[PDB]
Amino acid sequence: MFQQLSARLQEAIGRLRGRGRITEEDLKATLREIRRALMDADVNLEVARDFVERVREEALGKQVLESLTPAEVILATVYEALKEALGGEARLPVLKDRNLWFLVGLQGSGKTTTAAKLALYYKGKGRRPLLVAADTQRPAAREQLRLLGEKVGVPVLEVMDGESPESIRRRVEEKARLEARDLILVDTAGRLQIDEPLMGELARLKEVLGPDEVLLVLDAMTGQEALSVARAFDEKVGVTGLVLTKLDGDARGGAALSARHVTGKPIYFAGVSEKPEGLEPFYPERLAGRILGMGD
Ligand SMILES: [Cl-]
Ligand SMILES: [Cl-]
Ligand SMILES: [Mn+2]
């Protein structure tokens, strides 16, 4: 993702090289070019205007009009604004002695494989995770998680067809006690579309299990729809953080750049490949650098 935006931002910066000091009108032209690059990447007008305004303020504060290398000043201020847009500092869910987290999202989001990859990540960090396959309607969805848990070496409790939330809670508590589990990852039902009956189920399960995090998994390649999905889950269930999958796919890029501003939720993890280790903690500064051609 973000190949076109990357090329357009780098080109806007590059057009400032080899010209000496620039004028106020030159600076305004570059700012318009940056806003256009963002909007072509499907960033909305409000988000893009705010971004450019931050670039303008910071560049003026760094003396851009007096610099012999204004391209470098713009590079630095775009880098900071991108790093800010994407979340600022890297963030992860808080671990306490015991933890129960939901994963929520649509079928095509990579939610179930994300649950397994998260479990593997945390097992490698010394946690003792339990996966819970919580689709009370679809046995195949539960079996998919069983098999992935087997592959990553993490136990899986599967709910029963039509099992009540209270029964799920009892069985999860029992297994977690017998197996000394300290991180419970509940993979909730995935559907192709949002559904009143489904949202009512997720909200009820949340009341009964009391998760401390609700992680919404979104396929980043779905564009502005991902922010609409995020709004629906946050309104009907309540979300604490995001996981963006398929960030390596061919797509424009603005969900990720538009998420802090629009949703107020941190992006915790990024899916950057299909390998079992392809899910990594999200680092806003490293994505910002890579968009601008810096680093790896
Ligand atoms: Cl479906
Ligand atoms: Cl999605
Ligand atoms: Mn209720």
Q: What is the CATH number of the domain that holds 45?
A: 1.20.120.140
3-state secondary structure of 173: helix
Which domain range does residue 82 map to?
A: 2-90
In a domain, 295, yes or no: no
* 74 shares its domain with 100: no
* 272 shares its domain with 205: yes
Q: 89: closest CA among 293, 281, 295?
A: 281
Residues forming the annotated binding site for GTP? 105-112, 187-191, 245-248
Domain stops at, among 42, 75, 90: 90
Query: What is the residue whose two structure tokens read 């309607």?
Result: 137
Report residues near ion ligand 3: CB below 5 Å.
207
* 183 shares its domain with 231: yes
Resolution of the model in angstroms: 1.1
In a domain, 293, yes or no: no
* 74 shares its domain with 102: no
Tell me the CB-side half-sphere exposure of residue 205, using CA atoms within 13 A.
29
CA distance 14 to 3: 16
Does residue 235 contact residue 249 with C-beta atoms inside 8 Å? no
* 85 shares its domain with 96: no
Query: What is the residue whose two structure tokens read 């960090």?
Result: 125
Does residue 130 contact residue 163 with C-beta atoms inside 8 Å? no
- Solved by what technique? X-ray
* CATH code (residue 204): 3.40.50.300
If you measure from the C-alpha of residue 201 to the centroid of ligand 1, how many angstroms do you get, rounded to a whole number? 15
Does residue 180 contact residue 109 with C-beta atoms inside 8 Å? no
Torsion of CA 183, 272, 270, 173, to 10 degrees: -20
If you measure from the C-alpha of residue 108 to the centroid of ligand 1, how many angstroms do you get, rounded to a whole number? 10
Q: Which ligand lies nearest to the CA atom of residue 199 in the structure? A: 3
* 16 shares its domain with 39: yes
CA distance 78 to 288: 9
* 242 shares its domain with 104: yes
CA distance 232 to 109: 15
Torsion of CA 274, 92, 142, 239, to 10 degrees: -120
